[model samples]
Target chain A: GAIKSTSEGQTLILTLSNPEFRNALGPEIYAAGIEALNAAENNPEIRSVVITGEGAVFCAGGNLQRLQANRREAPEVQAQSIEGLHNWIDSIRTYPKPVIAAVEGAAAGAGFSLALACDFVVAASNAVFVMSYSTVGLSPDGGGSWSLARSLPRALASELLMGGERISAQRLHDLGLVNKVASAGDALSEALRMAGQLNARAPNALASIKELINEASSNTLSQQLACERDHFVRNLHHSNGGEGIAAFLGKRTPQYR
Target chain B: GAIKSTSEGQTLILTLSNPEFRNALGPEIYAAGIEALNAAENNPEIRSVVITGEGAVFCAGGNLQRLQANRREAPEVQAQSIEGLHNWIDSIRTYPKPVIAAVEGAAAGAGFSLALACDFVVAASNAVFVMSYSTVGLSPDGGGSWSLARSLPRALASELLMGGERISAQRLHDLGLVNKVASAGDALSEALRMAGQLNARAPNALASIKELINEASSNTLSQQLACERDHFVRNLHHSNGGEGIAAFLGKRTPQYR
Candidate 1:
């Protein structure tokens, strides 16, 4: 029912703690997710973020009972709830620091979309992902359709979204959607290791790269090239960039700030 | 030197026939590519298109000799040339039918970009792919940077674009950049096989799917959802939709227009 934020060195771990509902998402969880990211963005000690579930399940998407109850309410109520979910997804994409998803078991519907929104995904070998909306006669929400359409081939995307098929993490890894497939209990540890690697890089450059990636799909080549040039110039003047160059030239590892 | 257009059943094959220059791209090839696609767009008989190179080498990219000469001319001359290339890339993306790339030997520089622009890429096992622009002190052109950055993680995209590394076809296949790896000389045949599979699907539905994918990256979740709804309704009303349903219920193959 809540997002528990804890610090592990320079990495911020956000655990979805709703064991009663199997880490099901709600308006409160959405608000908490955005708030956590907002706070972490300004914290210099936090270089990255890892999202995982409290226990065996990663997330079960929305609570079906709550959804059935909402069916009697005004349609605007559900629309507003979806907006809150989308806002959190947008926050994750635009966050300056790298965000990783460490999924242990099932990531269904919006839960699957949540993992897709992260910069990287480290899933357990036995993890399962499904776009379960169509099975319930509901269409996708929380950007699931958008993310899958962009990252996968048209037929594969259609099969997952329209067929509501359950796919394994290893299959997704081969498809380039999952970054790493770890032993069943080691997803979070693998994600933390990835975060450690990101923590050692120049934060400014990483930020620039993230921003560039976010814009590249929408921009024309000329526009993206100009954007790349501006970011390159800005990062070159940053102190960390100078240290990186000096370190490489001196055959030493530079400690980035 | 030229793009040779041929037909096999319902598939249109456009071969890059500039072996003298290692199938290097230029204004002529770009114009020919756009023209071929334009003609195929209106021909109901042509269900798909395949792009490949003659003989062993796929392409060496922009002819270095031509580039050096352009540097001697007005900058606008080279700018205009790139505009032509971008137009062809845009044409392939917006084409109503599927387009596949069959790469052999090496696909370097803008040559690699050309392959990436296709709907599917089938490459020879020994084929090499490289973003060779940086090696010559230039940046990416022909939507190379845009495609790579959108489809791959930031670090991997940076390594390919900045390091100018030559990667194997199998490696690119593992990354999901290449759809299939064929025997050394079987790229064209493999690509044709994929084209045959696509040819069996309903053309209208496939066209809608391709457009949805092209627009997905730039659109917000709500926007994409609305677009999907529109396409779904339209396709549901098409004759092929009815045929598809009846055929499935009858346990027979669908014969779509």
Candidate 2:
């Protein structure tokens, strides 16, 4: 019923806990997600974040009963609810630290969008992803269309979104959408291991890489070159950068601050 | 060295013809490419375009000899040369008809960028790709950085651009960069077959999909949704839409105009 925040080492784990509804998303979960990420952004001890579901199923997307009731309310009510989801999605994208999705079972509709928004996705081999909105006479929300269209060829994107087809984690991995495919129950562990590797690196460099990747899609080559130059110079002068260089030269583990 | 344009049915085949230099790119090739694409854009008979090399090699990227000559001239000379390549790259991306790259031996530097700009890439199994800029103490040009950063994960893109490593076509196919991988000598034939498939579809629909995909990266979710809605409505009112629906319902292939 809530977004539970826990920590394993320097990695913060946020679990979607609402098994009664298969962790179906709502306004409360959206607001909780945003708040949790906002808190983690300021926490120096947290080097990365992992999002997963509590039980076997990842998320079932919107609750049909709640949606049916919303139909009785004004259109603005649904719009506001979607805005909350979008804000949470935006927060995850703009968050400085790396965010990984450990997906299991089915991630449908907005749940799939949520997984796609993460910087890295470690999905169980048996996990299934689908954009179920079109099947229900609705369109994608939570940046599903935006992510798929940008990352995939148009036909594939259209097939997933328009046909509302189910796709496997391995297939998505091949398509570069899912970062890794783990054993059925080892998605979280794999994500944590990947996060640990990322945590060992200089945080400033990772932040710059994430920012650059996000902005690269929109910026011209010349513009991105300038941005890259600035980031390279800034990171070169950072204390962690010096530590990284010295550790590599000395053949020792880097102790980045 | 020039871009030789020919036709096979509804598909236009543009060959990089400069075997003496391994199909190296220069101002002549850039201008010829732009001119060919410009002519193809308005040709009713041309449904798609495929770019390939004249011989076993695809392209060796920029001519180093020309670069050395330009350096002896002025920095502006090289800048102007790069702008020409960028223009050709832009023309490919903006081309209404689908553009496919048939890569055989190698696609390095700007040649790799050229292949990346295409809507689809059909590569030989033994084909190799590299961003050789950094190895020579230079950076990516011709939108190589832009394409790689947008399509790939930061780590992979950094390895290709910063490390200047050689990547196989199969590896790139796994990464979703290459659309198809064929036998060494079949890259061009495979691309022609793929182009034929595109040619069978409604050109208007394909054009809209291409435009939508191009704009999706820069547009917000709301903006993309509006664009999709507009395209959907526009296509619905088009003659091809009616023909397609009627043919599907009748269990027949649609003859799209």
Candidate 3:
């Protein structure tokens, strides 16, 4: 069955239905999640996506029963999950839109990996995070290794991955990874409020700058200059960029073209 | 001939002898040093290898005279030096052994690269480290980029690469690149003591554990797990993994197999 989806103004909220599994992802949820993002990408009315889980738990990550069953024969399932997760990750990173995760309770295993995959996270003060692979004779998957390397220091990341220690939401916020640490029961409300503010802003300017920063990491100065040249040219004539300029001169909010 | 080698108690000491050229590596010396490591790897009695230099310097890196002479026709010499340095770096990293650099004086260019390549470096307080490639209008060639990235933060590594700042031993020790900063003349003695401490450890356990930490960053968990499996199996017969365990259970410092 499809997960619950509702909109508050321009920001759409998707809540994981099965709180008991802590929203542990399976194949059905995988297709549904990607489909939702694809739908949001094409719809002009949807300015952002907010993903959260029902109850106090954000998500428990992968279903343990599913993990135990896979052992060695289900390469196809693991590959499919990885492919979708990577695609979803690329979409969140590449989509000309922002995505936020509202996390409460705990995000463990791939669940923590998912929260890390989002553009911003609004976590409850008590929210817990763990990369739990080492506990079960497994290594981190779902981009945890890559994400941890970028987000934490070597000694700390080593301790986290090697020791699998639980970290609180405030610690994550201190790291500049979390956007806000909400009251115990208000993670979703706070995240949506932040999403609401972004929804009201001019989209094209933000998207262009984000794309610039994303590609800038790997590009040489000359390469980035070329990229900037093309982006500048393309956006110069774009109605949003033009309107932004005109609005600045006229001293009014120009309706987005 | 060879540089110079001597043994005192548990430590095997080697010194670079061609100080007239700032102890810059020559073909014969470089080949013999690599041979020494190969021999040390197999010899059961040789506990650790400590490398320093004679005269008032550690090394000026590859001889600049050779660099100028060879640039016109013998480019292969420089290429071989780089190849040998990379080989030595990998050897020190992977060897079932530990190698320490005892910097008695200045280390510059590939000299700094050599010190950086070691597992632990103990430098005299007055010893200066300079990555001088840019002063000669050349980029660092001997794994300077990778080594610096591994040891220093991105901003500081860039400063060294671009500015060729002559960093003092104290600064390097503070950065953790140098394990110990000895008084101006006592680096050798301190390094020898450190080598002695390592000598008492279970060789097999220490070697394999060091190897695991080295490989942990690059490989995936599954790949590492498989590697861990192989290492454990190999260590059951080779490294002190087996001996240490047997010693602990038998309540004695069991002689290493």
Q: What is the lDDT of residue A126 in candidate 2?
A: 94
Backbone clashes in model 3, listed as residue pairs: B204-B239, B204-B240, B205-B240
Task: Write model 2 residue lDDT over A1-257, tens digit each, in one string.
Answer: 68999999999999998888888899999999999998889788999999999888788787755655555565567666777887888889889999999999989978998999899999999998998654443456677778897887533564465446688898898777899999998999999999999999888899999999988877888999999999999999999889989999999999998
State the RMSD for candidate 1.
8.9
> What fraction of the true interface does each of the listed models get right, in terms of native contacts kept?
0.10, 0.11, 0.00
Residue A46 error for model 2, in Å? 26
Which lDDT tens digits does candidate 1 get at residues A1-257?
A: 89999999999999998999889999999999999999889889999999999999888787766665455565567666777888888889889999999999989978998999899999999998997654443456677778897886543565566546788899899888899999999999999999999999999999999999888767888999999999988888999989999999999998888
Q: Predict model 1's lDDT versus the native.
A: 0.85
Candidate 3 local lDDT, A1-257, one digit each (tens): 23678888888787766666778866666677777888887687988889888788877766655544443333455555555555655566677878899998988876787787777899999999896544333445555655664444333453354445687898688667798999998999999899988886667766777689767655778999999999888887888878878988999977773
Model 3 C-alpha lDDT versus the unseen true structure? 0.71
**TM-score of model 2 vs. true structure:** 0.61
Worst 10-residue lDDT window, candidate 1 chain A: A132-141
Question: How does residue A114 of candidate 3 score in lDDT?
Answer: 76
TM-score of chain A of each: 0.99, 0.99, 0.91
Q: Candidate 2: lDDT over CA atoms?
A: 0.83
Better of 1 and 2 by lDDT: 1
Q: What is each candidate's DockQ, to 2 decimals?
A: 0.08, 0.08, 0.06
Give, for candidate 3 chain A, the lowest lDDT window spanning 10 residues: A150-159
| Candidate 2 lDDT over residue span B1-257, tens digit each | 88888999999999999888899999999999999999889888998999998899888788888887888987898889988998998898889888889999999888898888888888999998999889888899888898888777789889999999999998887666777899999999998987786777777777776676778878965676566545544554466655554554466887877
Per-residue lDDT of A231 in model 2: 99
